Amino acid sequence: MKAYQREFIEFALEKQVLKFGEFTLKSGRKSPYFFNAGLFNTGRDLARLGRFYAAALVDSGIEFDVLFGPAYKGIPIATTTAVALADHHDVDTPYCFNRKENLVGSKLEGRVMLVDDVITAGTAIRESMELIQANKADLAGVLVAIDRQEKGKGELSAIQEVERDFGCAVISIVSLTDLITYLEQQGNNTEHLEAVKAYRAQYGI
Amino acid sequence: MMKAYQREFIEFALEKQVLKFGEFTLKRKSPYFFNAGLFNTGRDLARLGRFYAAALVDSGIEFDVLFGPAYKGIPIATTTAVALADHHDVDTPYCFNRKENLVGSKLEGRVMLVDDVITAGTAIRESMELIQANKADLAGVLVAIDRAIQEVERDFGCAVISIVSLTDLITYLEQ
Ligand SMILES: [Cl-]
Numbered sequence A: 001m002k003a004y005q006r007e008f009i010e011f012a013l014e015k016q017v018l019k020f021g022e023f024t025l026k027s028g029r030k031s032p033y034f035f036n037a038g039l040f041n042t043g044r045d046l047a048r049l050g051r052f053y054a055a056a057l058v059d060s061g062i063e064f065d066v067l068f069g070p071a072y073k074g075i076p077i078a079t080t081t082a083v084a085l086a087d088h089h090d091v092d093t094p095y096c097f098n099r100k101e102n103l104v105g106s107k108l109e110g111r112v113m114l115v116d117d118v119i120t121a122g123t124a125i126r127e128s129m130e131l132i133q134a135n136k137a138d139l140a141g142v143l144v145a146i147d148r149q150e151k152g153k154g155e156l157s158a159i160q161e162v163e164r165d166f167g168c169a170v171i172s173i174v175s176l177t178d179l180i181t182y183l184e185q186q187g188n189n190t191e192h193l194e195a196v197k198a199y200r201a202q203y204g205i
Numbered sequence B: 001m002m003k004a005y006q007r008e009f010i011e012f013a014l015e016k017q018v019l020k021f022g023e024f025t026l027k028r029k030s031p032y033f034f035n036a037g038l039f040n041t042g043r044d045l046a047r048l049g050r051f052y053a054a055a056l057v058d059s060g061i062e063f064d065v066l067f068g069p070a071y072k073g074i075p076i077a078t079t080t081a082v083a084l085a086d087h088h089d090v091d092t093p094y095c096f097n098r099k100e101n102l103v104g105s106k107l108e109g110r111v112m113l114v115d116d117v118i119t120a121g122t123a124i125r126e127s128m129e130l131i132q133a134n135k136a137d138l139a140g141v142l143v144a145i146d147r148a149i150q151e152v153e154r155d156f157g158c159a160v161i162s163i164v165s166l167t168d169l170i171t172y173l174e175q
Helices: A003-014 A043-060 A076-089 A122-134 A158-166 A176-184 A189-203 B004-015 B041-060 B073-088 B121-133 B149-155 B166-175
Strands: A018-024 A028-037 A066-069 A095-098 A103-105 A112-117 A137-147 A169-175 B017-025 B029-034 B065-068 B094-097 B103-106 B111-114 B137-146 B158-165
Touching: A003 A169, A003 A176, A003 B094, A018 A076, A028 A103, A028 B041, A043 A076, A043 A112, A043 A137, A043 A169, A043 B017, A043 B073, A066 A076, A076 A095, A076 A112, A122 A137, A137 A158, A158 A169, A169 B017, A169 B149, B004 B017, B004 B041, B004 B103, B004 B158, B004 B166, B017 B166, B029 B137, B029 B166, B041 B073, B041 B111, B041 B137, B073 B111, B073 B121, B073 B137, B094 B121, B103 B149, B111 B121, B121 B137, B121 B149, B137 B166, B149 B158, B158 B166
Parallel strands: A066 A095, A066 A112, A112 A137, A137 A169, B065 B094, B065 B111, B111 B137, B137 B158
Antiparallel strands: A018 A028, A095 A103, B017 B029, B094 B103
């Protein structure tokens, strides 16, 4: 995986946004991990998050003319991503978000990149799509923080349903698979820990 | 004289024509106009948080949570928190409301609100009532510009501050 994906995971772990262990999901299943981007709730958590969404966006190479964040959760995420693009990528993108009710910022025109936290059932995307549709712009992509890569009600994932229903690509910072790589790519900790302690014991303090 | 950040903010806000001086009518009259909703690019937003952050640091007001009223306060609070963290090493909990309820960090201690103009009365007062109803205190409200304020200041017991003043705007346009 690339550097930003590794640094995202570590950051999510540091902030307790990502956690491993036993977890009962409010949506049936028992899961081995918990992920809740809502815990990125301070100014430095947001700065970093804008920068990780921005990195993921530039990595995809998808061209977009406006970054749209749906009310309400998409608003801060679009905001910090837009900021990360101006200051760290020298990309000055128009940005837009809606009021529930009607548009703040730029016009919804051309290729629209929707940014949000997660794709649960595709709800926020459906209302937004009706705004894009209405404005005769098209949905070029949706960017979320994590792609869980698991079957839903049927056989397609929640992301795959969004792709089918709206015709856009879904972009994620990271995926279940990255979480496995990350875990599989760890330097046998207790092995090195003991050797480091042993080396210390003989040369320490 | 006005500080560097104050001069730079006026210059910024005038270029984008988001800030205007003249004679305007609100739904009552005003000598200035400012609608942060007119900023339309990420670079605008970037510069915006930095000016709010500079104002907030300069004010020396202590606060535990940065709050943004729906809807315009939300991107303002977000980018202001990003700037605080990035440029001033101040990592502040943030929160905002759904006009619809709260999103972000738990609302506790002293809460500083940020928004574009104070004639954003109804949105700010409600946010303010909502903060209080949640047992947190009000540190103050920071707007981009002012001289309305009197009212909020009387019945909520907190200060209303701004990045710049009407005087600074008029002085700027003289120089
Ligand atoms: Cl608003």
